[PDB]
Amino acid sequence: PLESQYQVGPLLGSGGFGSVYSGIRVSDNLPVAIKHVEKDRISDWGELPNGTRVPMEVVLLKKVSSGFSGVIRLLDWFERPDSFVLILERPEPVQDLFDFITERGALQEELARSFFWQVLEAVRHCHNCGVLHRDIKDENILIDLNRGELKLIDFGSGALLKDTVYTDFDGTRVYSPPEWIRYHRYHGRSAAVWSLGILLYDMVCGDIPFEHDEEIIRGQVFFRQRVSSECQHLIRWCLALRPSDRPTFEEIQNHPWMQDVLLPQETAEIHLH
Ligand SMILES: Cc1n[nH]c2ccc(-c3cncc(OC[C@@H](N)Cc4c[nH]c5ccccc45)c3)cc12
């Protein structure tokens, strides 16, 4: 009985991911998000440890959902005749990174450093749990405005982490690496790093660097806003045309621009409150 266990609120959004409603856990008034996904619209199917056919996101969220708060938590899930229903964490107040950047324009590098660091930690946590997100972008990052903490959402395009090639991609085109565009194949970590490069650019420039496939393939980064030489270098490094020329997570976090990051709470008090 999910209809009586959660008090359904307003529809927050809908699209290829399905339909996401605002919710309240009747048990303790905990703010939740209720996600509906039709079985026909499900591309990747997964298997629970107890052996049960289920949406891949459920499998992935289970592997990542622990104490760490850089990833959104799967609280529960139900199966309906023609759909699955996911119950998720909901911060409040909240705003995603896309709306935040849209509203504020390009971010100050101190703020972008904090946000980007937190994303890196979240992505690093996912890969540790054997999970690849495959659609890292502002729109899939929630900001806990009160705590200054960022959270990864939407693992519906994700996959089990592996060391061999991926030949399928269902993330956003303009966030996809040139090797996907050219060869329809990529590797997990190097492709994630590319999208992280796209993400960082968007934070400090207020917009995406590449619009068309030809721009992605060319890999020429033009900066439309004032950005420090350190940050430009890190961005151009993440956006190296050859995957093996891109930095590891460790190299990104050891980068000179990545130093002296603010704490999430400091971030909130300075940039959010
Ligand atoms: C608002 C919220 N709180 N917790 C969660 C968890 C998961 C989602 C979520 C799940 N699946 C897909 C999602 O899509 C995010 C974007 N790709 C699309 C989007 C843009 N604006 C909204 C508003 C509400 C839902 C989705 C989107 C998010 C949202 C929330």
UniProtKB/Swiss-Prot annotation:
ATP binds at residues 12-20, 35, 89, 96. Expressed primarily in cells of the hematopoietic and germline lineages. Isoform 1 and isoform 2 are both expressed in prostate cancer cell lines. Pfam families: Pkinase (PF00069). The modification Phosphoserine is found at residues 66, 229. GO terms for cellular component: cytoplasm; cytosol; nucleolus; nucleoplasm; nucleus; plasma membrane. Induction: By interferon-gamma (IFNG). Strongly induced in leukocytes by the JAK/STAT pathway in response to cytokines. Induced by different cellular stresses, heat shock and cytotoxic agents. It catalyses: L-seryl-[protein] + ATP = O-phospho-L-seryl-[protein] + ADP + H(+); L-threonyl-[protein] + ATP = O-phospho-L-threonyl-[protein] + ADP + H(+). The keyword Kinase applies. Keywords: Apoptosis, ATP-binding, Cell cycle, Cell membrane, Cytoplasm, Host-virus interaction, Kinase, Magnesium, Membrane, Metal-binding, Nucleotide-binding, Nucleus, Phosphoprotein, Proto-oncogene, Serine/threonine-protein kinase, Transferase, Ubl conjugation. Residues 6-258 form the Protein kinase domain. The active site is at 135 (proton acceptor). Gene3D superfamilies: Phosphorylase Kinase, domain 1, Transferase(Phosphotransferase) domain 1. Its cofactor is Mg(2+). Autophosphorylated on both serine/threonine and tyrosine residues. Phosphorylated. Interaction with PPP2CA promotes dephosphorylation. Ubiquitinated, leading to proteasomal degradation. One of its GO terms (biological process) is positive regulation of TORC1 signaling. Its EC number is 2.7.11.1. It is an enzyme of class 2 (transferase). Interacts with RP9. Interacts with HSP90AA1, this interaction stabilizes PIM1 protein levels. Interacts (ubiquitinated form) with HSP70 and promotes its proteasomal degradation. Proto-oncogene with serine/threonine kinase activity involved in cell survival and cell proliferation and thus providing a selective advantage in tumorigenesis. Exerts its oncogenic activity through: the regulation of MYC transcriptional activity, the regulation of cell cycle progression and by phosphorylation and inhibition of proapoptotic proteins (BAD, MAP3K5, FOXO3). Phosphorylation of MYC leads to an increase of MYC protein stability and thereby an increase of transcriptional activity. Belongs to the protein kinase superfamily. CAMK Ser/Thr protein kinase family. PIM subfamily. This is Serine/threonine-protein kinase pim-1. The lineage of its organism: Eukaryota, Metazoa, Chordata, Craniata, Vertebrata.
